[PDB]
Amino acid sequence: MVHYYRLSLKSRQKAPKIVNSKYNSILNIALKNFRLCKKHKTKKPVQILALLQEIIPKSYFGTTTNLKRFYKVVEKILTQSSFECIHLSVLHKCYDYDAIPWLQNVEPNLRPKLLLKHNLFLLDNIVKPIIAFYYKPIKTLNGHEIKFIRKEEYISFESKVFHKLKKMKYLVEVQDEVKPRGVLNIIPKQDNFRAIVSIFPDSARKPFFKLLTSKIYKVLEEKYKTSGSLYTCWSEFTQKTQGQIYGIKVDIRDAAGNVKIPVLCKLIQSIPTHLLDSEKKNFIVDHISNQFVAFRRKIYKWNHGLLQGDPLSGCLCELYMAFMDRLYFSNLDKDAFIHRTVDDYFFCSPHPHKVYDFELLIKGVYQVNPTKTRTNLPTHRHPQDEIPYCGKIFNLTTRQVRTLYKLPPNYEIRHKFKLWNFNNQISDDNPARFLQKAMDFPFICNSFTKFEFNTVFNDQRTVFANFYDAMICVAYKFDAAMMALRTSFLVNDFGFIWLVLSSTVRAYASRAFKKIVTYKGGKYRKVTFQCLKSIAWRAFLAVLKRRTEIYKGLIDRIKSREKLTMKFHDGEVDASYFCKLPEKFRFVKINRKASI
DNA sequence: GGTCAGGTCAGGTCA
Ligand SMILES: [Mg+2]
Ligand SMILES: [Mg+2]
């Protein structure tokens, strides 16, 4: 009942020098080259595809089509997403066994299972180890994107920042022996960095760690007035204000790093004893006061704010900022709007000067990221009407809000979707259950909420454009799933495809109708059940056009019937946006080629 | 057969 192979590197093994008796000795040639490959003869430019072809003799596959079949899996590995899998069946089905010389002696009908396991051996003992030798997998944290960087480069970057973190005395060799709680990792996040700790497993302590986090969060609801729902505060404020809205979003930089431990410790002691007893208080106090981290066989003490990667740090920083909240935001004009996520602040008022004062206040209290500041203030260098905050885009002039989409140029959109589940596996003969589990609604549910479908402050044009953008996303996921179906299910029967799509469009439109009818507003005109379906269908249409030759049947299929009459009772909807693909998603890369 | 709360999972969002 195990049908999956995981692409991730940690599954790898450490190659024996010789292959055992149950495997054919040709493997050892490969292994030989492994040592020779190991020889420090590498320069900056290597291609893993290229070096592998000089490690595994072509005589192992015999024919070029077999070799290409195998290297296309290798290429998938080299371009992999986190959690991604393939079907074990891929490793043996459709190979030309006649042309493989070392497989002729054994009778043909017992041959397939052997070949799968032999290819598994090569992938686990030579391919993955060779990838590990020159590269480190890091999760970009934008979807499941994984970028590989040269080990020499990652180590150099990690040494540079280690020394910088040493000159500023953030890190100090402890020398007094102390049990370290975890290992430091330096993770790049664009121009800046993220220094985090991976905690050594401390079994039975995560019940304890969840308990302490829970009890503090209860304290943070109970003593400090909840920030409000982000949606409701903004709703009330939009109704309040009929004039031009003014606003600012600021991003505090290293909010954990700018925590003053003495003040936090005093907040701890100041907690009432009925909420959190003195023993737990004292356990927490030397916990944040004695942060010990293991580097290259050496232990250091972190003495700058809260350490990311600590179980308590996420929740603890919120308490500090929550306390800062009351310290500095008790008096605010109730004709104004304010909301905070954790280290991001969004503030709006009808008066420009009061927004300016808020900006000066925050800069006076905190070191901020000036590049991350967005404002409609006129006196600012690069002012904008669109403020991104908490996954959404707010237009202060129009009051319209759109979903925010994190698609950098050349981002590969298949990294956004986690299509493989190792815990519940689907057999290679069952593609339909796979595709429909892929199209479960819950996954896009976070773009099917009151925020995008309300008509209280949102126009019908923007509720449509939101639904469209989301449906564009669902189309891109369909595409990735289809490409998965061709390359590992090796499906030939596309007749059953044209079915769940419309079953989903119907159900999705119905769910939309429900939400839109649930949140009618003063800007709500009239929305036809069928019009939503037409929008969804036009979204799929716009997407499917990227790979026309593969889908020309399907596009033609939906071309007839499937009503797209975009004659909505509004007399304003441009409708050009709906017809084609928004520029954000025209420039994103769907194909797959092994770069390095 | 009709609810419920409780428990688990799932793919997603935010920081
Ligand atoms: Mg966990
Ligand atoms: Mg938990």
Residue numbers in the entry: 1 to 596
What does the paper say about this structure?
Throughout the TERT catalytic cycle, we observed that Y256 rests in the minor groove of the DNA and is in position to clash with the 2’-OH of an incoming rNTP. Therefore, we hypothesized this residue to be the steric gate in telomerase. Compared to WT TERT, the insertion of a matched rGTP by Y256A showed a 1,490-fold increase in kpol to 5.5 s−1 and a 12-fold decrease in Kd to 73 μM. Thus, the sugar selectivity of TERT dropped from 14,000-fold between rGTP and dGTP for WT TERT to less than 2-fold for the Y256A TERT variant. To test for structural rearrangements, we crystallized the pre-nucleotide binary state of TERT Y256A (state A6), and saw minimal structural differences compared to the WT protein. The position of the primer terminus was not changed, and catalytic residues D251, D343, and D344 were in position to catalyze the nucleotidyl transferase reaction. Upon closer examination of the active site pocket, the substitution of Y256 with alanine resulted in a more open nucleotide binding pocket. The distance from the C2 carbon of the dGpCpp to residue 256 shifted from 3.3 Å in WT TERT to 5.7 Å in TERT Y256A, showing that the TERT Y256A has much more room to accommodate the 2’-OH. Taken as a whole, these results indicate Y256 clashes with the 2’-OH of rNTPs to provide sugar discrimination and is the steric gate in telomerase.
